[PDB]
């Protein structure tokens, strides 16, 4: 089981995929990846869905 940005569960708006040539339609919800904020000399895990 996995969460987005290690955050609570949320229903998100399905956004049309950005334009491309010779491709069928698509839809996503998140445009960017999540990476943890910085604390020095540590391992930190960041989840995107």
């Amino acid at each position: 089981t996995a969460f987005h940005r290690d955050d609570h569960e949320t229903d998100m708006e399905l956004k049309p995929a950005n334009a491309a040539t010779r491709t069928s339609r698509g839809w996503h919800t998140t445009d960017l990846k999540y990476n943890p904020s910085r604390v020095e000399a540590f391992h930190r895990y960041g989840t995107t869905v």
Binding site: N18, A20, T23
Partner: protein, 50 residues
């Protein structure tokens, strides 16, 4: 009138045109493969920009 001649009937062989004919075109042959590798690649390399 009676005739001393002997008949002979010659008609020229008529013209005939040959139209181009193909059982399978090369596009059907390219489509024969269940997976055209190139098209799969082009589709799958658009995921980040899409």
């Amino acid at each position: 009138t009676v005739s001393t001649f002997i008949d002979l009937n010659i008609t020229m062989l008529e013209d005939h045109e040959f139209v181009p004919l193909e059982v399978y075109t090369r596009h059907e042959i390219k489509d024969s493969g269940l997976l055209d590798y190139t098209e799969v690649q082009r589709r799958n390399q658009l995921h980040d920009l899409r």
